Design a protein around this ligand. Structure first.
Ligand SMILES: Cc1cccc([N+](=O)[O-])c1
Ligand SMILES: [Zn+2]
Length: 257
């Protein structure tokens, strides 16, 4: 099945998921010179004070930190969005080296990693229904650069030993995702897709301009994870990013001057 090897990586996904060659695929390169400032965009409203993290899972593709999405406890609103979007999970994509790992790029620059906070539109009732709608999801994307440690990331890093292989989970309560945000909420936005199969074209992307800094040590621990299951040949979970896709007939809008 699909993955990030030579034989099963991004360049193969279209055979099982033909929407991979669609009109609104993600990620994309953000050309900062052609993204136009849209004064009609609102500030983003990130309301995570009541967020309830539950569990962390190695799904064989990344690790997901999962939230209780049975009520409006951690929600994204404003920005480009109409209505209310509930946080369901976050996860990262990262590289084998610090010079690649992000999905989105900025003027062709690749960051060491990218965080995706996934939210679904409450008007559709559940996640599964939301992903069938063009405005079903809002994903907040945050770039990671290697420098100073991110204190708020360390709780995630330190549990990764317990979910080394595919299918492992661990309790992961009381984690505050506010500690993963940069100072500024300036953003770019465009319509796109999930970046993993099934690649559904259901996402309003909100990509923050300001990266967070993580330490080398932190990212090294991501790279100790495994794609494989327990007692299978070890294959390090690295380079779990889809490259930039054609922009096609889209515009990327900037919230800032
Ligand atoms: C399959 C799946 C589920 C949730 C989120 C994404 N995504 O952001 O690409 C993909
Ligand atoms: Zn992602």
């Amino acid at each position: 099945h699909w993955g990030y090897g030579k034989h099963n990586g991004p360049e193969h996904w279209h055979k099982d998921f033909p929407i991979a060659k669609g009109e609104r695929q993600s990620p994309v390169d953000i050309d900062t010179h052609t993204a136009k400032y849209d004064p009609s965009l609102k500030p983003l409203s990130v309301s995570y004070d009541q967020a309830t993290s539950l569990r962390i899972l190695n799904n064989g593709h990344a690790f997901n930190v999962e939230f209780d999405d049975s009520q409006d406890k951690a929600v994204l609103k404003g920005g480009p969005l109409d209505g209310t979007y509930r946080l369901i999970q976050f996860h990262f994509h990262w590289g084998s080296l610090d010079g690649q790992g992000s999905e989105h790029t900025v003027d062709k620059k690749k960051y060491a990693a990218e965080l995706h906070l996934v939210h679904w539109n409450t008007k559709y009732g559940d996640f599964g229904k939301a992903v069938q709608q063009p405005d079903g999801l809002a994903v907040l994307g945050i770039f990671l650069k290697v420098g100073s440690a991110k204190p708020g990331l360390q709780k995630v890093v330190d549990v990764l030993d317990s979910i080394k292989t595919k299918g492992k989970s661990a309790d992961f309560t009381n984690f505050d995702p506010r500690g993963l945000l940069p100072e500024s909420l300036d953003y770019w936005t465009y319509p796109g897709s999930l970046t993993t199969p099934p690649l559904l074209e259901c996402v309003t992307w909100i990509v923050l301009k300001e990266p967070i800094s993580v330490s080398s040590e932190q990212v090294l621990k991501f790279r100790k994870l495994n794609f494989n299951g327990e007692g299978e040949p070890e294959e390090l979970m690295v380079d779990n990013w889809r490259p930039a896709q054609p922009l096609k007939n889209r515009q990327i809008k900037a919230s800032f001057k």
